[PDB]
Predict the 3D structure of the following.
Amino acid sequence: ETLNGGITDMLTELANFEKNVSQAIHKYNAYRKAASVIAKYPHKIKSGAEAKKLPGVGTKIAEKIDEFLATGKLRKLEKIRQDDTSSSINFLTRVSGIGPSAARKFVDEGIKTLEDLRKNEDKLNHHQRIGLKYFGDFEKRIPREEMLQMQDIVLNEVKKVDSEYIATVCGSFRRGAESSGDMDVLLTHPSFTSESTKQPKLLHQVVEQLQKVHFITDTLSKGETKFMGVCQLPSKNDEKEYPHRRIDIRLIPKDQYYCGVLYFTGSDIFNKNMRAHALEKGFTINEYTIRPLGVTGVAGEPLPVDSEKDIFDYIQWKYREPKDRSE
DNA sequence: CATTAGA
DNA sequence: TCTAATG
Ligand SMILES: [Mn+2]
Ligand SMILES: [Mn+2]
Ligand code: NA
Ligand code: NA
């Protein structure tokens, strides 16, 4: 956690580099398990050899550990850190839409800078277009203060359309969080559960509504159950316009809300920790359900959930407020 | 790990 | 279809 720190960190640095700049999924996969194990290791690793004893620890990596333990650096990390080509890949990547794959390609063609990205907006697909467009706005944290106004509106229209809808803004915002990256809204309706062969419109109507009023400004991706866009709070009575925010709403079979909800609420750890528990408690939890465990090794049979509570009860735990789902 | 664009 | 990008 801090004793193995640099090691895991140069290691991660290393891995990440192969996967993006290089198309070396393996080496990349190498660095990670290694980075994974030394990480767990209970003592200050003192030399390659020592490290080497570890599963996933090759001669390759071990050697890197030495140079790093010896000199508080690494040539390969320095060389990369410098590499203009590799720098560029790292960056274009920021654009919502641009992945490594396209990052290389662009680079090759010569789009290194943001401005390049501009002159060639043509080479970019709609996602990346918008990506490039709200580049600033996108990189900005979301004050809860705004999250409150946002949630407010979504909630309202959702309701105006059909009072029957249920909505939850999940994520950290739900979890107290002073700020948020983007807004996650989970949606479901009663007329839409496990079987009941869809009702695409279900999503659709709402999207239409939010746009109707100008909350949604653009569509990144809209499918029958997952809409992904851009929004913005009404820039008041001028002088102060609001930044464009990433928003995502998804339809959910009413019969799998709370789990899904439980789930997306986090935290990453509270979840795992929660999950790890239901296990002992004779269960199984996952993004949509909670099945009672059987001794033959495994088992099925989706237990009925009416609220975050039920889930808790099941595994017989103490209801934890979002606020304290911290871990 | 499953859902969308796109080619 | 597969392959990328998001989450
Ligand atoms: Mn979020
Ligand atoms: Mn998110
Ligand atoms: Na070994
Ligand atoms: Na990106």
